[PDB]
Design a protein around this ligand. Structure first.
Ligand SMILES: Cc1noc(COc2cccc(F)c2F)c1-c1ccc(CNS(=O)(=O)C2(C)CC2)cc1
Lengths: 247, 10
């Protein structure tokens, strides 16, 4: 069962290493978030390696997918942590870093934080299961490709199609009349709505990266590498977001 | 070798 494998390979929670004794400025909160994103990205790479079917894809494509989807994976996992631990009342970045209204303001990311909070409120509305969540996160790893496609497009499409089949079989376990088509479309709609929020997070990311020292915001090595590669490709329009339902 | 390349191949 691929879904049961997904449940067991889900990375363990990591601490942000947040310093509450230091002034709660935008530079210190953002630097803590960046440090946390760095650690979580190492976890994402180790998770992707043991993901069923991911090793079939060539190395270049595996890198491409991780680099295009990183923000989508981190934000989706944030929404899940927020839903599981606080019933989506707060943004649960880590056990030592839980954002309330004050931290959403101090981080200079209020509107972005509210946008993420809306996604977590959808988890409450839908009563999203862990089974669904784990399949959806794999679909997010496979939801952004280069405009001119991957080195092995057919291998990628076969992997993505199979995880779409997994999500469809999983929604049958949560029926209304006994129908599940409604839940499946609510899940694909929620997946599509990640692209727009992630487009805004990436815009904030890219700005803070271009002006990091002027803003006193630190970036770990993992992020420097990901962003230096992704910033030119995304801004040049070389990214192709994959939607279940075209806008 | 990049950090992503190192982690994926190790
Ligand atoms: C860690 C971590 N746990 O979830 C997330 C999700 O992202 C969000 C971050 C803040 C508010 C939100 F509402 C989010 F949805 C991250 C995360 C942290 C830092 C970076 C890179 N820094 S950045 O300038 O791009 C910025 C825009 C996130 C702060 C990327 C991801």
């Amino acid at each position: 069962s691929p879904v049961m494998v997904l449940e067991n390979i889900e990375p363990e929670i990591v601490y942000a290493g947040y310093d509450s004794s230091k002034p709660d400025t935008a530079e210190n909160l953002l630097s803590t978030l960046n440090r946390l994103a760095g650690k979580q990205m190492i976890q994402v790479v180790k998770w992707a390696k043991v993901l069923p079917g991911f090793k079939n894809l060539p190395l270049e494509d595996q890198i491409t997918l991780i680099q295009y989807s990183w923000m989508s994976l981190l934000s989706f996992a944030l929404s899940w942590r927020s839903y599981k631990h606080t019933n989506s009342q707060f943004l649960y970045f880590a056990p030592d870093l839980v954002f309330n209204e004050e931290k959403m303001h101090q981080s200079a990311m209020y509107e972005l934080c509210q946008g993420m909070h809306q996604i977590s409120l959808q988890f409450v509305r839908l009563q999203l299961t862990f089974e669904e969540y784990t399949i959806m996160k794999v679909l997010l790893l496979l939801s952004t490709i280069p405009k001119d496609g991957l080195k092995s497009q057919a291998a990628f499409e076969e992997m993505r199609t199979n995880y779409i089949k997994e999500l469809r079989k999983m929604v049958t376990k949560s029926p209304n009349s006994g129908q599940s088509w409604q839940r499946f479309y609510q899940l694909t709609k929620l997946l599509d709505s990640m692209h727009d929020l992630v487009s805004d997070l990436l815009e904030f990311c890219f700005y803070t990266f271009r002006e990091s020292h002027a803003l006193k915001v630190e970036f770990p090595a993992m992020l420097v590498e990901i962003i230096s590669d992704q910033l030119p490709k995304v801004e040049s329009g070389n990214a192709k977001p994959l939607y279940f339902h075209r806008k | 070798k990049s950090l992503l390349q190192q982690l994926l191949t190790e």
